[PDB]
Amino acid sequence: LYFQSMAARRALHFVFKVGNRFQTARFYRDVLGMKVLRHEEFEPYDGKWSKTMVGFGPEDDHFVAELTYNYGVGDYKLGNDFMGITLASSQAVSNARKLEWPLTEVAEGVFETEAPGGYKFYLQNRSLPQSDPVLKVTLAVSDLQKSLNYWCNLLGMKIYENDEEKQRALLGYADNQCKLELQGVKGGVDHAAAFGRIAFSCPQKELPDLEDLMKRENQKILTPLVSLDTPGKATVQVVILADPDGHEICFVGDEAFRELSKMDPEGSNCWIDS
């Protein structure tokens, strides 16, 4: 009935598959200027793995990167599904130049770089005091109208920009949150092996409403309501969806997620090269 219309929605993070942890530490810490917020070790990949949340500040008020490492997996073929994270940091641009991390000005004051694995980061050469540098995540879509119907009419995001000519829309749950940019492409959306997942929270009571809505609307549920455990921390509940182009989406219950996502004060000891 009302899942599409509730106010309490928050963009959390994007999940990246990491093959090369040492170069990844160099990129996120020394180029971007991000820090480790929390790091956890867990005992289509079956073995040991680790999750490192990295960003510009606590997950309560920042959009962060979830870095996933599967022990024994050194490479993930990157498709054309993820088109970049855009952040405002002249310092990151300065860091790249000082470290000779390759970068290219691709639009006025916007410098394109790649994280290890090939994931695009667009660094706007400016500083925004008080606020999260992370501005948007861009994903490729095959049919923008279909994607808008799903992200706006079902998931309830609002439209900030809609450029019909360029087949590009900018969506968000609030003015102060990271935005999701949908960019129409020709040739199909290929997720290959490095595909990620974008996560949002909502009150836990609404998770079954989300599932009901997606069933009613004949949309894909990858994982029905399930509880996930993290050693020594709070158990959370998630529903995992796929959007019309197969992009993975996690909705997590916000109250438990806030307990889980407390920022660790000793995070920096957790970089692999520390």
- Per-residue three-class SS string for 87-113: EECHHHHHHHHHHCCCCEEEECCEEEE
Give yes or no for a contact between 19 and 272, defined as CB atoms under 8 angstroms apart.
no
Fill in the amino acid letter for 69. Answer: Y
12 and 180 Cβ atoms separated by less than 8 Å:
no
Q: How far is the C-alpha of 88 from the C-alpha of 250, rounded, in Å?
A: 25
SS3 235: coil
Same fold: 1-129 with 130-274: yes
Distance CA 129, CA 91 (A): 12
CB proximity list for 214: less than 8 A, separation 6 or greater: 154, 220, 221, 241
Between the alpha carbon of residue 245 and those of residues 42, 131, 160, the distances in Å are 30, 31, 21
Round to whole Å and give the CA distance between 141 and 244: 8
What is the rounded distance in angstroms from the CA atom of residue 151 to the CA atom of residue 60? Answer: 23
* Token pair belonging to 50: 């680790």
Taking a C-beta distance cutoff of 8 angstroms, is the pair 203, 231 a contact?
no
> Measured between alpha carbons, how far is residue 97 from residues 20, 30, 31, 48, 109 in Å?
21, 11, 9, 36, 14
Give a three-class secondary structure readout of 193-216: CCCCEEEEEECHHHHHHHHHHHHH
C-beta separation of 199 from 187 below 8 A: no
Contacts of residue 53, defined as CB under 8 A and 6 or more positions apart, other chains included, come to: 13, 36, 37, 38, 39, 59, 64, 65, 66, 67, 261
- Determination method here? X-ray
What is the dotted CATH code of the domain comprising 1-129?
3.10.180.10
Look at residues 103, 99, 98 and name the one whose alpha carbon lies nearest to residue 124.
103
Pick the closest to residue 58 from 269, 232, 257, 227 (CA basis): 257
- 54-91 in b/e form (b: 16+ CB < 10 A) is bbbbebeebbbbbbbbbeeeeebebbebbbbbbbbbbe
CATH code, 130-274: 3.10.180.10
What CA–CA distance (Å, rounded) separates 243 from 4?
Answer: 15
134-141 and 104-107: which strand pairing? unpaired
Tell me the three state secondary structure of residue 260: helix
Cα–Cα distance between 62 and 10 in angstroms, integer? 10
* Residues 228, 40 contacting (CB under 8 angstroms): no
- The DSSP element (H or E) to which 258 belongs, if any, is helix 254-260
Tokens of 119: 């994931």
* Alpha-carbon separation of residue 151 from 141, 181, 244 (angstroms): 12, 11, 9
Which residues, at least 6 apart from 205, have a Cβ–Cβ distance to it below 8 Å? none
Strands 82-88 and 120-124: parallel
Give the long-range contacts of residues 27-32, CB within 8 A, separation 24 or more: 27/101, 27/115, 27/116, 28/54, 28/65, 28/67, 28/115, 29/271, 30/95, 30/99, 31/92, 31/95, 31/96, 31/99, 31/101, 31/113, 32/87, 32/89, 32/92, 32/95, 32/121
Where exactly are the structural domains of the chain?
1-129, 130-274
Q: How far is CA 138 from CA 44, 83, 167, 217, in A?
A: 24, 5, 13, 25
Q: How many alpha carbons fall within 13 Å on the CB side of residue 244? A: 20
